[PDB]
Amino acid sequence: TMMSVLANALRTIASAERRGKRQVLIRPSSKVVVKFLQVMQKHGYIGEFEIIDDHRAGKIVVNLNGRLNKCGAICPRFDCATTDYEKWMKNILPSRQFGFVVLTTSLGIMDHEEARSRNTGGKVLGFFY
Amino acid sequence: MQPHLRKLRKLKRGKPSDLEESVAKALFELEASHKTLRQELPRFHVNTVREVKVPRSKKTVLVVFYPLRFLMLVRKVQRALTSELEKRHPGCLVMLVAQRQITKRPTDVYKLQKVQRSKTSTAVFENILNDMIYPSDVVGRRWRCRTDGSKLMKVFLDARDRKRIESRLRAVAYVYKQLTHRRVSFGFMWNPKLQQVSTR
Amino acid sequence: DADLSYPTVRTERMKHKRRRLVQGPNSYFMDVSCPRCRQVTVVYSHATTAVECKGCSKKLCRPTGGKALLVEGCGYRRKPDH
Amino acid sequence: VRMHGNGRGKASSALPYRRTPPAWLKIASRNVVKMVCKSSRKGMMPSQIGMELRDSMGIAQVKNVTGRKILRILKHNGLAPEIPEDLYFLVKRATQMRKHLERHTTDRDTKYRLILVESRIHRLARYYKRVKQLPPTWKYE
Amino acid sequence: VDTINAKLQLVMKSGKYVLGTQQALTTLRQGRSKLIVISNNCPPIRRAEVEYYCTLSKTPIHHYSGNNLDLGTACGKHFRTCVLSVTNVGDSDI
Amino acid sequence: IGMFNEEGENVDLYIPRKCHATNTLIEAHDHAAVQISIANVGPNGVINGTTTTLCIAGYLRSQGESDHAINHITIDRGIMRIK
RNA sequence: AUGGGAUAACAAAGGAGCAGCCUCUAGGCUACCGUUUCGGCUUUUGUUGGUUUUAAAGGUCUAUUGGAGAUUAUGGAGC
RNA sequence: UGCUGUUGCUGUUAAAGGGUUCGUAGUUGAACUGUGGGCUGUGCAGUUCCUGGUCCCGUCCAUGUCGGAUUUGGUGACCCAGGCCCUUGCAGCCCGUGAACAUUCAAAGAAACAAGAAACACGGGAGUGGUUCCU
């Protein structure tokens, strides 16, 4: 019973970053798991993927460069109006400098900083410091 | 009209092209009994177009479009036609690509549920590999996603088949781009089962 | 030393078929030739049924649980995958 | 995990990535489609039909040769069973256990294994009505 | 055993049968009967003449394994039959 | 390599070393925290001018992947030969 | 009220429980609606009331003009 | 007072998992239809041509088996390199695309056509539009 396929995905990345692994192999890839990872990769927290075809649901193989402290998923996916970036910045991120909160917006999966500038709000997905 | 002009699509029977004629003839000669077993599937068959594509290296490619109605014909014969269409035309590679419509993404939840999956892009563009590559198989796919943001497909043929198709792939890689406007890179792998990219 | 995305021969020869990176089958078709008549029938590796020659009905294999036993020196020829 | 009872065991057929039929199959689609139906007129189910093909006749997957699964082939020919076969083999177990327990009324183990089996039937019969594949008045008895 | 119980289903959706001992004697008298199935509790002098027409007409009796009520549900009908005769088989092989 | 003031003044107290395996900062209080200085060699086999030094964090030695990790590094550095 | 369409929800489906090929012209026949009984009716002919014809329209039958086709009819099947 | 806990509690032993299993209301629920391209100028990363600083070949020795040197060595190997718009990817900018594929080419995709489109095309009203609007 895989309820959220990000929950399973970003834990593995999280809990295999805490062990210093060079690579992680993630069980059910999905359109959201990729778009989330490609945001991690934009800011330098992950090296590379392989998305392997099983013909059913892929298997992502991520190269870790050692720079992730944590990866969450926020499970119920609460909303954000663009005025609510300050709650999430405040509660879930360590400092007001270096964290990132990842959202789904009309425009897509993007950072809370890519969202403030485009003015969309959306639903929260997770974070990474 | 002329006996070999019934190997084209009817619009192009009136005013064919210097390209479209020369396969028409060649398809006809082979329609006419010459090749055993293609005496079997000559007569019901047609061509829509053909296009000349020049890869940036060496030999041109004539991309012969025929209507999807004929796949199950050609898949039997496809190894024979291309071989014996190339003898007829020296110095250019002959590829056989059925023609397919692609419905745009609907955007309505209620329309997405009505779309023929075989008319969707991902399904179409795949069959435009299997057409360029046939009889050989796609053993694996991988999408390599690189820090740049680049995502690149890798399609793994059998190694048993290395000897025939190696020479064609730089073209097949390129033609595919011109048809799809997507990109492909090939590698081979031997036990396809245990997945080991051949290097040797 | 190892890549996860390109594993060694020795690691993945060991794994379960579902635990492979691929999910492959463990089975294959053999080309079997009946001893009693010279005739040739394809036979599935794990038969799970009584399999008979066509001309003579000989029961060319036993159903036995894991992997079917061919009968009495009948010639097997293993078919390719493709 | 498992629907009723606790096993976690995992054993399944793992279908191959490569879906084109082998080169050594010389059997036309229409010759497969007719085997299916020919052997379904012998009063067989699909879950067995597919065996006699991979066992003896060497057809691994009928979708991969014939364009289509063993039931569209039956549903198109009007040979498709009246009750889905996952539902037929449960009713068939439940009834034998009902016949078992009719002499043996102190056998508590199979009185509990019914309670499971029947509760399945009512879940499938809830699926196959919702999905419209059973008549909405279908009932156990 | 119940190996027959599978064949009566196929005859049921295929072939022609008639139920009941008095309507199954007419299939013997006409020599149209390809099988005769008889229950356990079929009364003896009824069993006896049914078996006797089957020796004259060379038709292959099968003595069933259960009641007329169970014979009857095998051919899934809600009533009871002590005698069943198969006019023609199906793809069920006798 | 530290947080700079708006006026450009480097504000850090010191900049810690990072494990060359795990890329974790080595903390003042971490007393495994090894440096391993391999003497760099030149033809004829004499030592000259050798800067290549490895840093391993306290974590990793105590599980015994220090050795496995120093194989990986000396191979990326070319100090070793795979064969 | 109005943009956006990533994530989601509602509804429908359950796949033989189906399913429209388009097009040039020619001919033939043919009211059109409505029903409980006499009912309704499209412009033009100067106008209104009454009658009637011709004509398109649609339909339907036959005729072949050009082209399609997401599944080979010069094909499968049986003699 | 995070001692009512959505943010945010606790439940082996401190208070607290029903004795087990089935199960309705209820809550939760797997993957998929989807990297648009090309041209210009400019920032990044991964085969022409030039190096001789390597290993391989070879030579001389022969050294029973842990010397070596040898020149040209050797299109071999290799390398550090170049304002090669020949490379590919990628950042940013301009800008074109009926823009996958097919299909049209008439005065500039017009018309047909493909795609889309009910915010639409298909016929119609002078009691429509400040006296029936525009060219």
TrEMBL record, chain A:
Coiled coil: none annotated. One of its GO terms (cellular component) is ribosome. GO terms for molecular function: structural constituent of ribosome. It comes from the Eukaryota. Pfam families: Ribosomal_S8. GO terms for biological process: translation. Keywords: Ribonucleoprotein, Ribosomal protein. InterPro entries: Ribosomal_uS8 (IPR000630), Ribosomal_uS8_CS (IPR047863), Ribosomal_uS8_sf (IPR035987). Belongs to the universal ribosomal protein uS8 family. PANTHER family: 40S RIBOSOMAL PROTEIN S15A (PTHR11758). This is 40S ribosomal protein S15A, putative. It comes from Leishmania donovani.
TrEMBL record, chain E:
The keyword Iron does not apply. It holds the Pfam family Ribosomal_L7Ae. GO terms for cellular component: ribonucleoprotein complex; ribosome. Residues 3-94 form the Ribosomal protein eL8/eL30/eS12/Gadd45 domain. PROSITE patterns: RIBOSOMAL_L30E_1, RIBOSOMAL_L30E_2. It comes from the Eukaryota. One of its GO terms (molecular function) is RNA binding. Keywords: Ribonucleoprotein, Ribosomal protein. The keyword Ribonucleoprotein applies. Belongs to the eukaryotic ribosomal protein eL30 family. This is 60S ribosomal protein L30. The lineage of its organism: Eukaryota, Discoba, Euglenozoa, Kinetoplastea, Metakinetoplastina.
